[PDB]
Amino acid sequence: KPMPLTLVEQILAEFQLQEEDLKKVMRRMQKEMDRGLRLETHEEASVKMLPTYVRSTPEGSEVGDFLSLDLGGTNFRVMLVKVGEQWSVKTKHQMYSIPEDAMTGTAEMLFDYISECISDFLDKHQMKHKKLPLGFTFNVVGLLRDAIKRRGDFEMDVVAMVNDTVATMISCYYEDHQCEVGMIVGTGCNACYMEEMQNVELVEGDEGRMCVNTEWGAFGDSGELDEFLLEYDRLVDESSANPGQQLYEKLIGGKYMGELVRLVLLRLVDENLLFHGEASEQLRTRGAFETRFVSQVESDTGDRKQIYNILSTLGLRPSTTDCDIVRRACESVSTRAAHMCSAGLAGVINRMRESRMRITVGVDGSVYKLHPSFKERFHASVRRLTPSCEITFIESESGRGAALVSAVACKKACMLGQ
Ligand SMILES: CS(=O)(=O)N1CCN([C@@H](CC2CCCCC2)C(=O)Nc2nccs2)C(=O)C1
Ligand SMILES: OC[C@H]1O[C@H](O)[C@H](O)[C@@H](O)[C@@H]1O
């Protein structure tokens, strides 16, 4: 690395977060999860800790057979699943490519094509009498119900989807049975984990555990993060659709990460430390610096070409120094996102530890998967904040994890009386 520009470093250093800071954030998250878990304070609690009814014991034994529907980009998978016995997950499936016609009509006309494919599948395997439960993997539930009803020839119960943190936990559990935490760092950020039943005051029972959906994005309503906010965070918060809300997520989520960078670049520019104090009209446009650009700038192999090309797309003609500064502005934001995020997962893992540590954590999300070194910085920060825990991280990815998600969602549904 070259000797950095001092003036720039003083501005980017404002993003730094010390251990003592993250422990502050951690402890504040912890008290907020306590408020969420308890009957008495749950309604005013901003971190809701939603019981998911996904228990540590297999329930809904009378659901052995079901249909799993993995809805993807340009196609979908229909999959028949039979659960037996550890659970014996038997599957057969079919890939269906969505025609361009079906893609480009309306959402209702789309799900009629999906329903049509389901009919063919059931005919192919002689199951059009069986009235199977159907889960979704990746209001489409509503659309499929209406599209099946519209057909009338076969009957089918489309169950409620699980939260994406829960699906991540369940599909990662398939491959590593030590997984008891699900986490998403994409557009938004959330976490779920297996809580002790005695702590889940909203569902009575002492025995076993239940997944709890933290919905921790809402953390910060009472100013729990105020001392750690910066002018740019405040600006993002004011221009957003929901000012004063989702403050924790605003620091971390992919939804705003690009906008934060853009604002940092404008500060630098206005300080005459970047682009000779001259921004483009694109750069002065809200939303122009896409979050994908951040990962791209931080992927640059050292030759400045991915950075140059991105900045050129915004109507800038950057010097080599300008490209270095952008990289460092991107890293500041990323690394701060990773810190803030690690403080949340640390509060969860330390809370789980008190009740008892080798533990696996399932993770998903574009930021965690695709941002060059978010995961690395994130891992190291959590491990630091969680002494006496050994944390294995895995990413969700033959379609049997998805089948296990759909089995749980259907069995949950049976258990709750539909
Ligand atoms: C027999 S098994 O080894 O295949 N197996 C997987 C399923 N589960 C949990 C879900 C898991 C989800 C991940 C964390 C631990 C519970 C489970 O099925 N929970 C349910 N809650 C409501 C309906 S079903 C089990 O208890 C054990
Ligand atoms: O998609 C990740 C997360 O984004 C948002 O925070 C949603 O509120 C939450 O339900 C979801 O788990």
Swiss-Prot record:
Outcome when changing residue 369 to A: Small change in glucokinase activity
Keyword Nucleotidyltransferase attached: no
Activity response to pH changes: Optimum pH is 6-8 with glucose as substrate. Optimum pH is 9-10 with glucosamine as substrate.
Listed result of changing residue 64 to R: In MODY2 and PNDM1; decreased stability; no effect on glucokinase activity; no effect on affinity for glucose
Impact when changing residue 190 to H: In MODY2; uncertain significance
Residues reported to bind ATP: 70-75, 187, 254-255, 291-295, 366-370
Enzyme Commission number(s) from the entry: 2.7.1.1
Pfam families given in the database record: Hexokinase_1 (PF00349), Hexokinase_2 (PF03727)
Protein's cellular compartments: Cytoplasm; Nucleus; Mitochondrion
Phenotype upon changing residue 369 to E: In MODY2; decreased affinity for glucose
UniProt-reported outcome of changing residue 35 to H: In MODY2; decreased enzyme stability shown by thermostability assays; no effect on kinetic parameters for glucokinase activity in vitro
Annotated effect of mutating residue 375 to E: In MODY2; no effect on glucokinase activity; decreased affinity for glucose; no effect on affinity for ATP
Impact upon substituting residue 397 to K: In HHF3; increased affinity for glucose
Activity modulation comment: Subject to allosteric regulation. Low glucose and high fructose-6-phosphate triggers association with the inhibitor GCKR followed by sequestration in the nucleus.
GO term, biological process aspect, one: glucose metabolic process
Lineage, top ranks: Eukaryota, Metazoa, Chordata, Craniata, Vertebrata
Outcome recorded upon mutating residue 220 to R: In MODY2 and PNDM1; pathogenic; highly decreased glucokinase activity; decreased affinity for glucose
Pathway: Carbohydrate metabolism; hexose metabolism; Carbohydrate degradation; glycolysis; D-glyceraldehyde 3-phosphate and glycerone phosphate from D-glucose: step 1/4
Name listed for the protein in its UniProt record: Hexokinase-4
Gene: GCK
Similarity comment text for this entry: Belongs to the hexokinase family.
Residue ranges, annotated region (Hexokinase large subdomain): 163-397
Mutagenesis or variant effect for residue 185 to M: In MODY2; no effect on stability; decreased glucokinase activity; decreased affinity for glucose
InterPro entries: ATPase_NBD (IPR043129), Hexokinase (IPR001312), Hexokinase_BS (IPR019807), Hexokinase_C (IPR022673), Hexokinase_N (IPR022672)
